[model samples]
Target: SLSVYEKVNALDKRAIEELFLSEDILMENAAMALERAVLQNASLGAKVIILCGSGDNGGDGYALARRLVGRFRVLVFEMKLTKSPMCQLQKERAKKAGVVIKTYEENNLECDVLIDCVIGSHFKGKLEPFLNFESLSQKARFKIACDIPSGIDSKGRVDKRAFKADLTISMGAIKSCLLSDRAKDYVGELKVGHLGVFNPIYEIPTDTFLLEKSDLKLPLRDKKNAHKGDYGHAHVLLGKHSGAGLLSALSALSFGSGVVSVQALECEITSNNKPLELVFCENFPNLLSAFALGMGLENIPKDFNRWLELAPCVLDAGVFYHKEILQALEKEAVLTPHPKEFLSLLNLVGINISMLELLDNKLARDFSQKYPKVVLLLKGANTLIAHQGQVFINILGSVALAKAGSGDVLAGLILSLLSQNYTPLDAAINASLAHALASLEFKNNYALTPLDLIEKIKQLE
Candidate 1:
């Protein structure tokens, strides 16, 4: 798991005591880290603006402004005279270095790089009225958020007036605030800053992780003597919306399911509209490895519920509305549900929690501790995969996946992994990673359809 901390105060304190590092050293390191990210795209004589607040977060602003004075046109909009000892110390040092420190009321907002160092890990609730970040954010060539975007709460909740940053240089380790679904838009690019010590000493291990691209394990074929049967047969239950099942089947085949088929219970699953590779069946196909259902399953029958128990399966959409999901969880199962569907699933299992409670991520730990057997993949702007007490967050998902039929494609990828013999946890995690990374490939977000998304999977290494 990657280092994700609720609060690094204890960890930082420990570093100070054991490693002989002081708060100033940590703050200076954070200051230099911000400098690197800002200077990366900064041209010669760039007009850089810094918004300094009252706390240690503002100290970064003072420290950065002091370092960047002679190299560029540095202007500081002081939100406060000074608050924290560190902030006061850095501010005086900046003034001594001849850095331009102006009052927050200053209207000169034009800048090449606009830096927001106003709020840090201490942010909560709503933003107090300041200069128009929304208006100036558009005006600035690039916007940088220090610690986090100013209006995102410590728990990752976003205020409407949050600073929209082109890059966020998080101090020390990656915080939960940087990985929220709503925080996705506000934080453009995320960079972690060093805090005096290496991660081994700086970070205290947590169950939550931010999944990386390296975590993706494709179903690559290595066996030259392998048969279609060796890769395992994947099945999808055709529902009232048979086209959803077809989309799932296509993705499963595309992602390396040796044999992909759709089982028809009511109407014939086969049609000319379906792809040539999708085998149509009236019954649960023999030698079925893993089956995916509930994508468009509006008419989930009692008899067909047995298929979930007979083999490893991925549950999504319509399946959450039924009690058979309980039986499926008892066996090899993975549940992929958006917040609305997950709220239904929680209610189905007799646990009551609001959507707001679910988004906070702590409730998932308790839920996972209770159901250690099943894997839960909650789809959002940032996807969450939970199994046994560990939660993996896939932040790579983009707006391109906000279209219809993408969930079906996601279910297909998970089904492909399940059929190819990945553990339920591995299947859910990798599928979520692959799904998110593939979405990042498209340049036109709105133009990406499910077919185009399916085609992108082959393009990934």
Candidate 2:
């Protein structure tokens, strides 16, 4: 989904006005769509209170009032005098249509539904005192917001006074804010109001997307005549912490890697804990093998540069400890880092910033742009995969993945897919989706460990 800035800038206001559609027509469509949504969701002939401000959002309120005047008991609360020409036009039309237009007051306003059209895409900063309708909003049976809820910024930052809607009607496309974790409470059930003018080809290119199950494309099927070697062997560098390494190795093997070799640096392996299918190696394998590193980050390998030179490598956890190794491995290498790890990696690269100050999606994109070659997978509530300028947001996972060693499982899965010759981005996205889905299998049961996550990889659709 395009961010608010991208949507606004891409939408050539002048071009839209001259060539395809006018602001008046778009407002009419928006109002009509909103009216249909309200009628479908709310009770028939409900007393509707339309909250209007002095902006384009207010124009939508007046326009909607004009449409719903006779169908329902429409009361338009003009919070302030509208500055938009379209709003001024709609205000007069709504008044002529017999919609009850009134000024803002502290009177006990009663209504079946409260429509918040006070703010739209242009909203920023703290919400004003007059726009704080919490007391009146609580009095309504249902709450609906036009475009975006008032007081919620485009980036999903919610003000204390933000209107908590029962449903948010998007103007054309799904705004980035509506899908943000911060805006979840304010933006209720979301529905898009398609105006038919937002075209991807014509509009600004959006790198961010909401990942879905349908977006997951499985790796190519193995050939009937193919040998085990054709599937590609995954070489994992095991650290002092054997549990993380074991989980990663098992996860890779479970995902159909032809062969998985775990080279223990410090930990001694035993059959009681290690999988029988995995080959335990004391020495590092040939340089041609696909690599998965940073599980537990225990003993530092003296010849780590040789491992870093290998193509299609996934660096996670402790790999960021060696800042030079990260800078060395360019394209074909994927870095999987959670918030803490990401912050550390940024500091290693001389870009010192705190997690609270950092915007995950933007930071991932900026870092990828700066690196251009490496694929940076920022692990969080929403897993973001960034390469070059493109980004994919994986919204499929459950909080079940918050447990330890889950990231190791994810790294292994990506490495396994990479070994199968999947393109870096494809491997990253598909692996992310699969890993998230696997985590969901254990959603109802939080006690399930990373071992359980590894076992669930085979069940991925």
Candidate 3:
């Protein structure tokens, strides 16, 4: 899945054109897909109204009207007086097919289904001044957007006049606007159409991706005769809040870590009511393959730098509170922070911005891109893992994961994967998917404790 910028910038126009994939052909393919989508909800003779502009999106609308004229009560409303050449071609075809074309009016725009083809991905700023979206929305029983919802920009910014879609049929490829948090309400039930031109095998450079369950690979298998040490040991620094650390340890074990150990103040460490597999130690253990820090944010060792230098780390909570600790982080580090923690980290670097002003996923990517050495896991309903210039949006998980200690479990899961030699991005992606899947297992019941999340991790096996 390519971002709109990537698709627009890198799509090989020469190659596509050379193959006879002209604009007309693309419009025909797109119209076919749109017609199919409309047929899913409405019968053949349903009353359908297409709202069209002067662009290629309007071309798609006019073409679709031609296909539906005989089978459905098709009405095309030209929002603009002027039309693109492709749109004009389609309009002529629609007229030949006996489709009704009319100018926009403020009267009751009654229709069984309304299709929005007034704008495409290239649109920016506010919507055109003429369209009456309020009357259109009020009149339609159902709404479908072509390519992208009108009034939504490629970067995901949505204008108030943006058409609300029940289903958005994206032509050629999935556009970035549809995946944006702010555009979620406007872009509902998205469907991507390939149109035979967009091919994934043809590699195109992109920094953003819509992660799917199929993208996750199983954990590396252990050798038949492998020893416990072969899998790698994971270390967790237990803060004054021992329960959070214990949750992290259990999560690590469930995620397939060979040996999980916790370092805590002697009095704070206890075996009572703890997982038997977890080893509690007063001193830091021998060099570890991966480490989790700032669990509960208290009781961190005075010489925490020593442990950080030992292995790749999952830094969370307390780690971001201190400037020096964040500065000490190396390229091997994965920083997991929710929106609040993210703001704190930004303030540490002398950059303070309101969360209201910037989208969470955008902020995560901006921060990760600025700091190329660190991989950032921004936790939310949609967890965003950003490394270097690339971003992976984890669409799994739900409101069930909104409970306390959920992030702690995620931190431990990522640390476990890192311990087993997964690269920062890979570890973050896999752990994020696993953690969300585990939460989903208990979706019927939202009252999930971190311990319940740990137990559910076994379902992934």
Candidate 4:
């Protein structure tokens, strides 16, 4: 796992003033990082267009233009006038190095590679007429973005006109914006490099974290004396859609819960139709370790509020539809909601926001701050688990998880963990990481179903 920051400019400032690193050296390091990325993707003499702006991000382009002067077909465009001192200095250096420089015009050049070094992380949607990202995307065979991709705000909200990068090379460190659901389509492959400083000095551990595959912890049992009750029992509240509840119970069993009971409400899961492995119970177990609720739920149990007070509970699917549900819960809880459901939770609190705003890093942080009592696992292209103002982003999952009933499987994973004594926050984080890692087992997962995903979870060591 890696620490994620809202902005690294303060770190950059510290490196310049406290660490005694010059701005030019930082610019050179950013340039070298971009140089390495370009060479790995395209060979020498390939037509490469480096779009430059008036800020230090453009300084990175100018510095890179100087290094590739004699080796490649490098064309530098001053997309905007040079304003920053580093930008002015790098522009002069590139000119002295005999790099081809051009001012922004309506001319569209067909090139082998297109690079966007225009707006850095301080982007605020002020797009210039000369940007014309659509034209660039069409003409270039490959596209690269320097720093954060252009057309994304600081809060990770992406503009429709953003540059679509095949590979985005972030400078200093990976910013929170790059992990936004809206930015995922624009930021294809994300990587981060230093700006003349190592991680020890450039970064301090932040509350926000980007989860890696290595962070996944599997629930394993090896003791010969272990009993079935050692792992804890989980109760699944069977709702109107019995299949959804059945999937959750089966998944919880597959994920290592000792016993999973299906308590039907508004529907029946008798032995005639229920899975053989799951226990069919008509009443809620008073000694349950965890409760998994809300998958395809239509009617709230008359006395279901006690479910929250008794054990660690997981809420998903239809739970967010009720205004009084989350407002009354005071026990350990983890909410697994997609963007739309997350928006619904915000609306339940009378906090109205747009779809894109829910994906914004700022909103994610604030939502967690508001609900420190419950862990919010906001699902998206990048899964976000937030609790007590801390954000944990899981970018390890593949597109194969973009299917129906995947959320049910995820809820089951968390339920298993919560039953086995993991805290609501830790259970959410680890289960989310495992949920993402399990999908990676399939070589080509387009055809992989939810059943296949549960089987893969058992294989995790």
Per TM-score, the best of the predicted structures is 1
lDDT of 4 by residue, 1-461 (tens): 77788899888888888899988888999999999988989988898999998899999999999998878898998888999999999999999999999987784568888889988988885776667787766889889999888888877888767899999988888888898877888988888877876777888768888887777777877788988998989999989988788888888999889999998786866766788898988788889899898898985677867666788899988878787566444557898877777777888787787865654534467777876788888888888888887888988888898888887889899999998888898899889988878888888868768888999888865
- Candidate 1 matches the true fold with a TM-score of 0.95
Instruction: Score every model by TM-score.
Output: 0.95, 0.86, 0.87, 0.93
Clashes of each: 0, 0, 0, 0
Clashes of 1: 0
lDDT of 3 at 337: 80
TM-score of 2: 0.86
Task: Score candidate 1 by lDDT.
Answer: 0.83
What does candidate 1's lDDT look like per residue over 348-404, in tens digits? 788787876645754366667778888888888788888887888888887888888
* After superposition, candidate 1 runs with Cα above 4 Å error: 136-138, 270-274, 358-362
lDDT, candidate 2, 285-340, per-residue tens: 77445888788875457887766666578888876766655555465688888778
lDDT of 3 by residue, 1-461 (tens): 33433245345364365555666676788899999989997987889999888888899899999989778998899987546899888888988989899988655578889999998877878775566575577888889999888888876778887899899987766766677767877887777765656555323556788777777765757478977777779988777777777788888878878899887752357565556788876678757898888778654467767766678888888777777656554557898887787777888887787876344355367777788888888876567789877887766676688788998898889889988888888999999988887777874756888888888887774
Which pairs of residues have clashing backbones in candidate 1? none
Write the candidate numbers in order of decreasing TM-score: 1, 4, 3, 2
Clashing pairs in 4: none
Off by over 4 Å in 4: 222-225, 347-350, 354-356, 359-362, 441-448
